[PDB]
Ligand binder design. Sequence first.
Ligand code: NAP
Length: 157
Amino acid sequence: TLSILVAHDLQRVIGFENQLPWHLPNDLKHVKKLSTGHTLVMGRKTFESIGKPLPNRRNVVLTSDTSFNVEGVDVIHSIEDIYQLPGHVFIFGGQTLYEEMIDKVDDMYITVIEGKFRGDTFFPPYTFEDWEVASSVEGKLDEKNTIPHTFLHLIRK
Ligand SMILES: NC(=O)c1ccc[n+]([C@@H]2O[C@H](COP(=O)([O-])OP(=O)(O)OC[C@H]3O[C@@H](n4cnc5c(N)ncnc54)[C@H](OP(=O)(O)O)[C@@H]3O)[C@@H](O)[C@H]2O)c1
């Protein structure tokens, strides 16, 4: 299975200055829950913002840099390499990867951040006439999770 994994705001912002525009612990837990034991594919900029591989899952970074060799990280140099990765593969950003993969994935795990943030990177436009809502679940708000958010699982119609 090939899945997009992303959080975007009401205007599809996903990033600002190579970081998430929001602080939302519960979404990071959501990402951790979904991707643990599986594979995360990320563009080079996204990986460098994280800085180290996320524990307990396969970390795959897409880059043109043939000198890239990071302990705990598997490198790939083309989109086509993604299709060789066994198991459940999550496309985990950034903008370039989402743009390259949105027409190819089976489904998408999208956290809609119900706010308007300043962004410099965006998730590409999509329509629900192409995607069925398999589930839609409101995130719980608390002390440390203060922005309304909704967990969507969308499956290509
Ligand atoms: N909101 C979310 O759920 C979420 C999740 C992850 C990331 N993000 C955000 O996304 C933003 C980064 O997005 P971005 O588009 O600027 O960068 P990116 O997608 O993370 O990285 C772009 C780089 O990926 C490599 N790449 C992409 N496609 C390639 C291809 N077909 N062949 C070879 N290399 C390829 C290239 O690396 P080289 O230049 O080294 O060749 C390219 O410069 C950050 O702000 C981050 O916070 C948001």
